[PDB]
Every structure is written in C-alpha cells, then in structure tokens.
Amino acid sequence: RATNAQFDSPEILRRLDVRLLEVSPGDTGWDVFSLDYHVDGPIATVFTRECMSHYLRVFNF
Amino acid sequence: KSPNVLLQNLCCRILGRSEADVAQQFQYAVRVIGSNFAPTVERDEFLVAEKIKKELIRQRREADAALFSELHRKLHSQGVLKNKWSILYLLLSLSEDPRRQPSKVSS
Amino acid sequence: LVSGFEATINKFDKNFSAHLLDLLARLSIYSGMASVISRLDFNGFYTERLERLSAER
Amino acid sequence: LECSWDELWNKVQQAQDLDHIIAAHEVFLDTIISRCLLDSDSRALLNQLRAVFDQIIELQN
Amino acid sequence: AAAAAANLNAVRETMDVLLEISRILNTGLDMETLSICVRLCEQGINPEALSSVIKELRKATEALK
C-alpha cells in the first residue's frame, strides 16, 4: 500500500504469499526467506511445481 | 554401562575433567535427564528428513541433498540403534547453519 | 474503606488481567482473521506481558 | 532476464497449442539456470562467491 | 561367532554413517562423544534433555575462559 503497487488487480496480489523455510538455531533471516507465488487451477498444469521450485532457488540466490 | 555412570563418562568426554575431580556435572546431568527420562514425544523421523533436505537445498547444494538421502537410508537399513529418531533430533538441535560446511567422501 | 474499596478493585483487576491475557494467548493461536487481535490492541498499556511462556522438556 | 524473456514471449504468443507454451517455459527456465551460477559446473563460482559475500560485510565492520 | 562379528562390523558401519552426518551438519560432536551418545540412545533417552546437557557441558569449559 505504501509503494505504488496498489493499482494492481487482486489476482496477482492474491497469488503471492510469503513462505517460510525450516530454521536451524542461530541462522540469519536472509537464508530463511522465500516468496511462494503459488498458482492453482488449470494454470498449474501450464506452469508446474518443478518450475516453481527452481524459481525459488533462484529467488534465494 | 549403567545409564547414570555412562552419563558421567560423557561429562568426562566434553570437559577435560575427571570423574572424581568433579561430580557436580554428573549430578546436573542426572538432574536434567532424570526428570523426563523416556522420550517425551513420539518419533517424527520422516518430517525431519524432509527438513534436513530443506537445509541442504537452502544453501543451494543438490549433490549433498542426494547423499543425505542415502545417509538417512543406511540408518534405517541397519537398525542397530533402537531410536534412530533420537540421534537425528540431537544432531538437528546441535546444528547451526554452517553456510555450506563442506562435503567429502573419504574413499 | 480502602480495603472494601481499593483491595477489591485490585483483586478484580488481577483476575481480569489474568483472564484477559489468557484470552489474548488462546486467540493468538487462532490464524486472514487475526485482525481482531490487531484491532483490540492498537496502542495499548499492559495488554502484552510476555510473548511466550513455556517449561522445558 | 531480457533475452530469455523476449524469446519466451515470442514462443508463447505464437502458440496454437498449449504444449508450445509449456515447451517454451521450460526453455526459459533452463537458460536461467545455466546463465546463473546454480549448475553443477558453475558451482565452484558459487563457492568462490561466499568469499565476496563475506568480505563485503567484513569491510563494513 | 560369525554373526556376532558381523554385528561388530554392522555397528562400525552405522558409527561412520552418523559420523558423516555429524560433519555435514557441523555438529560440535566428534567420533568419541558420538560413541557415547549412541549408547545412551540405545537404552532410550529424551533428546530434549540430551541437547540441554550438551549445551551446558560445552559452556562449562567456557567458564575457564
């Protein structure tokens, strides 16, 4: 809301959700932070689960 | 060994001290272990295997994530340890993120 | 009196505060529907006392 | 992020069938993963990258 | 016998598998203390208490710091 991304349609705003990874004690928060961006429905067949996981690794780095 | 004196031997391993130079550490170890002596929860060894693989993927290593799949395999395949869940829970508690410690095979 | 007046207010305040913090804790485990907690505590004074209480083993 | 996107855009917008979108998305992924440092041969550069990522915060202190 | 020396080998194998897990997870334990933790864990133990014992025992030689 603070930045100018509140013009967006609710669908793309809805698909994103923050995803935790598991923590080992004394690990920094930068390693445990990845967005999920799930997609459900028929579009999940078009963009599969494996694609999303490789994108999450890209997101980490 | 009886479990109480085997608790004293562990305190001889960690510190340099002997079993007669100190007995307060063995007293404290019996104090901690002996109030909940049995496993206070049930085993969830599958879940934490799915968490240690998530540890090796988080540091972006995939050859070690498939090596750990065999390291978790051999423990179940041999079964000389009564609770395979307790040693992995222990190693999970005593681990802090090494930021990719290293890997090797040693032959 | 100050003990048929003030001590009764204090005892009621103790029990109400204890059950209020119990309510906030047992509502905090619940959950987008956590907005009731965030509305109820807007600025606050003594409605948060300890984040988690737990005993070992 | 721009050539892969342009290539992906052209191969998805032309499509007459859904497999032509899917087979383009996988190539978009498979050129990100190789132009970045997350392959098994670019792994050594990722290992060397830790030294850079260490000395930058070392310099702050 | 033969099956009792096959078991003496089959303990030696597990002790090295857990040793590999110990170094890739970077636990403070090495081979000697792991050989004590396995025998405790054989009889059945709460590891929730075991981890507290070891986080204290490693901190008691930091009192000679």
XYZ file of C-alpha atoms in Angstrom:
351
model
C 0.000 0.000 0.000
C 2.855 2.412 0.763
C 4.573 1.987 -2.599
C 2.738 2.394 -5.896
C 1.780 -1.237 -6.340
C -1.807 -0.762 -5.103
C -3.056 -0.199 -8.660
C -2.836 -3.932 -9.312
C -5.738 -6.287 -9.876
C -6.485 -8.557 -6.883
C -5.494 -11.770 -8.692
C -1.751 -11.136 -8.912
C -1.877 -9.620 -5.423
C -3.644 -12.780 -4.220
C -1.293 -15.365 -5.740
C 1.716 -14.199 -3.725
C 2.244 -15.410 -0.166
C 5.369 -15.467 1.990
C 6.869 -18.932 2.529
C 8.995 -19.880 5.498
C 11.778 -22.411 5.265
C 12.763 -24.502 8.269
C 15.197 -22.863 10.668
C 18.248 -24.317 12.315
C 19.116 -22.386 15.527
C 21.300 -19.324 15.043
C 20.670 -18.945 11.304
C 20.192 -15.499 9.789
C 16.819 -14.491 8.416
C 18.122 -13.775 4.918
C 18.564 -17.505 4.318
C 15.079 -18.292 5.637
C 13.018 -16.013 3.393
C 11.398 -17.016 0.130
C 8.200 -15.912 -1.510
C 5.925 -18.729 -2.659
C 3.768 -17.409 -5.526
C 1.541 -20.455 -5.828
C -0.760 -20.822 -8.827
C -3.770 -23.136 -8.708
C -6.325 -24.308 -11.227
C -5.698 -25.219 -14.858
C -2.767 -22.768 -14.952
C -0.868 -25.019 -12.515
C -0.701 -27.589 -15.320
C 0.882 -24.984 -17.599
C 3.462 -23.850 -15.028
C 4.317 -26.883 -12.945
C 5.651 -27.402 -9.446
C 9.224 -28.151 -10.531
C 9.432 -24.817 -12.346
C 8.363 -23.017 -9.199
C 10.959 -24.781 -7.027
C 13.794 -23.873 -9.377
C 12.495 -20.291 -9.341
C 12.546 -20.347 -5.535
C 16.201 -21.378 -5.550
C 16.852 -18.504 -7.965
C 14.935 -16.289 -5.529
C 17.187 -17.369 -2.643
C 20.377 -16.564 -4.506
C 27.209 -49.486 31.151
C 24.525 -48.430 33.580
C 22.972 -45.179 32.259
C 23.938 -42.988 35.234
C 27.684 -43.751 35.140
C 27.582 -43.542 31.331
C 26.292 -40.008 31.906
C 29.435 -39.319 33.966
C 31.635 -40.642 31.153
C 30.071 -38.156 28.696
C 30.969 -35.287 31.011
C 34.485 -36.733 31.066
C 34.484 -36.572 27.253
C 33.311 -32.961 26.873
C 35.370 -31.282 29.567
C 38.940 -32.220 30.353
C 37.916 -33.050 33.899
C 37.928 -36.479 35.513
C 35.054 -38.321 37.174
C 36.464 -37.711 40.679
C 37.773 -34.172 40.132
C 34.134 -33.220 39.573
C 30.818 -34.911 40.294
C 28.613 -31.797 40.088
C 28.359 -32.103 36.305
C 27.185 -35.711 36.636
C 24.714 -34.560 39.292
C 23.385 -31.873 36.938
C 23.220 -34.343 34.037
C 21.217 -36.788 36.154
C 19.086 -33.797 37.227
C 18.309 -32.890 33.609
C 17.941 -36.339 32.009
C 16.147 -37.800 35.008
C 13.037 -35.722 35.188
C 11.874 -36.773 31.709
C 13.889 -39.952 31.256
C 11.818 -41.547 28.444
C 11.092 -39.880 25.080
C 8.596 -37.150 25.923
C 7.219 -37.071 22.348
C 6.825 -39.677 19.631
C 9.116 -40.037 16.645
C 8.748 -37.894 13.523
C 11.908 -39.025 11.690
C 10.279 -38.671 8.245
C 9.466 -34.972 8.848
C 12.955 -34.043 9.919
C 14.481 -35.908 6.967
C 12.297 -33.558 4.906
C 13.770 -30.715 6.994
C 17.475 -31.624 6.632
C 16.987 -31.929 2.867
C 15.437 -28.468 3.085
C 18.613 -27.407 4.937
C 20.913 -28.622 2.157
C 18.703 -27.095 -0.540
C 18.630 -23.735 1.282
C 22.420 -23.453 0.914
C 21.878 -24.428 -2.759
C 23.541 -27.842 -2.705
C 21.963 -30.773 -4.512
C 24.702 -33.411 -4.622
C 24.728 -33.462 -0.824
C 20.930 -33.492 -0.682
C 21.072 -36.825 -2.533
C 23.929 -38.020 -0.333
C 21.821 -37.302 2.747
C 19.033 -39.386 1.217
C 21.433 -42.338 1.469
C 22.713 -41.293 4.899
C 19.154 -41.372 6.223
C 18.695 -44.659 4.328
C 21.613 -46.578 5.870
C 20.468 -45.705 9.408
C 17.077 -47.323 8.779
C 18.592 -50.211 6.838
C 20.932 -51.329 9.617
C 18.787 -50.690 12.698
C 21.430 -51.331 15.331
C 20.177 -48.187 17.093
C 16.887 -48.541 18.967
C 15.660 -44.991 18.334
C 17.033 -43.692 15.061
C 14.888 -40.586 15.668
C 16.796 -39.526 18.790
C 20.248 -39.248 17.188
C 18.921 -37.225 14.252
C 16.889 -34.978 16.575
C 20.074 -34.455 18.581
C 22.147 -33.600 15.502
C 19.360 -31.228 14.399
C 19.404 -29.471 17.770
C 23.202 -29.200 17.775
C 23.368 -27.774 14.260
C 23.618 -24.112 13.369
C 23.653 -23.148 9.671
C 27.274 -23.571 8.569
C 26.622 -21.685 5.302
C 27.737 -24.860 3.460
C 30.199 -26.515 5.885
C 31.765 -28.717 3.125
C 31.375 -32.183 1.631
C 33.774 -35.075 1.035
C 33.585 -38.855 0.674
C 36.803 -40.173 2.331
C 37.197 -43.132 -0.109
C -12.691 1.910 53.309
C -9.559 1.413 51.225
C -9.951 -2.332 51.622
C -13.666 -2.579 50.936
C -12.921 -0.318 48.018
C -9.375 -0.449 46.708
C -8.376 -4.030 47.575
C -11.482 -5.363 45.842
C -10.656 -3.264 42.739
C -7.130 -4.675 42.776
C -8.258 -8.304 43.164
C -10.778 -7.913 40.330
C -8.033 -6.248 38.284
C -5.712 -9.206 38.894
C -8.249 -11.826 37.843
C -9.471 -9.784 34.857
C -5.906 -9.141 33.672
C -5.003 -12.823 34.029
C -8.023 -13.979 32.056
C -7.550 -11.158 29.528
C -4.015 -12.315 28.804
C -5.294 -15.912 28.665
C -7.848 -14.770 26.077
C -5.223 -12.954 24.013
C -2.972 -16.030 24.082
C -5.685 -18.535 23.151
C -6.829 -16.161 20.402
C -3.252 -15.726 19.185
C -3.032 -19.407 18.255
C -6.052 -18.809 16.006
C -4.958 -17.778 12.468
C -6.915 -13.625 7.308
C -8.813 -13.428 10.570
C -6.139 -12.286 13.065
C -7.358 -8.697 12.594
C -9.471 -8.874 15.772
C -6.296 -9.120 17.882
C -4.552 -6.315 15.983
C -7.588 -4.076 16.348
C -8.105 -4.798 20.066
C -4.518 -3.787 20.842
C -3.989 -0.557 18.913
C -1.509 1.238 21.184
C -2.000 -0.486 24.477
C -0.890 -0.269 28.023
C -0.292 -3.568 29.842
C -2.110 -5.885 27.454
C 1.087 -7.653 26.411
C 3.226 -9.017 29.206
C 5.280 -11.898 27.853
C 5.343 -13.227 24.318
C 5.659 -16.921 25.191
C 5.728 -18.860 28.442
C 6.933 -22.470 28.341
C 8.598 -25.056 30.580
C 11.495 -27.217 29.401
C 11.304 -30.924 28.407
C 16.374 -11.546 -17.832
C 15.617 -9.776 -21.114
C 16.721 -12.103 -23.925
C 15.174 -15.105 -22.166
C 12.017 -13.059 -21.656
C 11.893 -11.910 -25.294
C 12.459 -15.471 -26.547
C 9.824 -16.768 -24.131
C 7.402 -14.023 -25.203
C 7.767 -14.878 -28.876
C 7.390 -18.605 -28.365
C 4.321 -18.240 -26.140
C 2.476 -15.577 -28.150
C 2.760 -17.525 -31.401
C 1.359 -20.743 -29.942
C -1.525 -22.681 -31.449
C -1.377 -25.371 -28.736
C -0.602 -25.450 -25.032
C 2.462 -27.684 -25.413
C 4.036 -24.833 -27.360
C 3.657 -22.634 -24.281
C 4.901 -25.352 -21.915
C 7.926 -26.287 -24.038
C 8.884 -22.581 -24.124
C 8.517 -22.017 -20.384
C 10.862 -24.933 -19.718
C 13.495 -23.402 -22.018
C 13.166 -20.030 -20.270
C 13.898 -21.874 -17.016
C 16.710 -23.958 -18.460
C 18.576 -20.915 -19.742
C 18.196 -19.022 -16.466
C 19.645 -21.988 -14.561
C 22.684 -22.197 -16.847
C 23.380 -18.499 -17.273
C 23.237 -18.265 -13.495
C 25.565 -19.959 -11.032
C 23.344 -22.841 -9.893
C 24.545 -25.595 -12.244
C 26.930 -28.336 -11.113
C 29.785 -26.771 -13.107
C 29.112 -23.157 -12.097
C 29.001 -24.453 -8.506
C 32.674 -23.579 -7.953
C 31.956 -19.927 -8.725
C 29.118 -20.019 -6.199
C 31.589 -21.401 -3.658
C 34.012 -18.597 -4.523
C 31.142 -16.112 -4.251
C 30.973 -16.756 -0.497
C 34.353 -15.033 -0.149
C 32.970 -11.904 -1.825
C 29.785 -12.085 0.257
C 31.964 -12.338 3.372
C 34.427 -9.556 2.631
C 31.721 -7.019 1.804
C 30.243 -7.220 5.315
C 33.761 -7.533 6.724
C 34.540 -4.159 5.150
C 31.521 -2.615 6.904
C 32.956 -3.617 10.273
C 30.956 -66.182 16.436
C 30.362 -65.091 12.840
C 27.047 -63.262 13.235
C 28.468 -61.573 16.347
C 31.430 -60.270 14.343
C 29.076 -59.322 11.517
C 27.220 -57.258 14.128
C 30.527 -55.789 15.349
C 31.011 -54.662 11.755
C 27.375 -53.517 11.457
C 27.867 -51.212 14.441
C 31.111 -49.897 12.904
C 29.177 -49.074 9.719
C 26.428 -47.077 11.469
C 29.074 -45.268 13.521
C 30.623 -43.950 10.285
C 27.262 -43.073 8.690
C 26.392 -40.942 11.716
C 29.954 -39.572 11.552
C 29.300 -38.347 8.012
C 26.027 -36.733 9.113
C 27.917 -35.145 12.035
C 30.348 -33.308 9.770
C 27.952 -32.234 7.035
C 25.595 -30.859 9.694
C 28.599 -29.343 11.539
C 27.613 -30.567 14.966
C 30.115 -29.969 17.744
C 30.396 -33.703 18.397
C 33.275 -35.762 17.039
C 33.696 -39.560 16.931
C 34.465 -40.125 20.615
C 31.488 -38.301 22.123
C 29.181 -39.628 19.397
C 30.189 -43.116 20.557
C 28.738 -42.225 23.968
C 25.551 -40.581 22.650
C 24.699 -43.675 20.573
C 24.945 -46.000 23.605
C 22.770 -43.656 25.654
C 20.276 -43.552 22.777
C 20.297 -47.369 22.593
C 18.710 -47.652 26.027
C 16.158 -44.977 25.106
C 16.508 -41.332 26.135
C 14.733 -37.975 25.791
C 16.889 -35.962 23.349
C 15.136 -32.788 24.536
C 17.101 -33.262 27.765
C 20.251 -34.520 25.994
C 20.657 -31.308 23.975
C 20.340 -29.243 27.155
C 23.019 -31.363 28.877
C 25.433 -30.808 25.997
C 24.727 -27.068 25.656
C 25.630 -26.832 29.336
C 28.723 -29.068 29.191
C 30.223 -27.135 26.301
C 29.616 -23.946 28.305
C 31.382 -25.240 31.437
C 34.785 -25.262 29.741
C 33.961 -21.698 28.671
C 33.946 -20.895 32.396
C 37.716 -21.481 32.351
C 37.810 -18.757 29.692
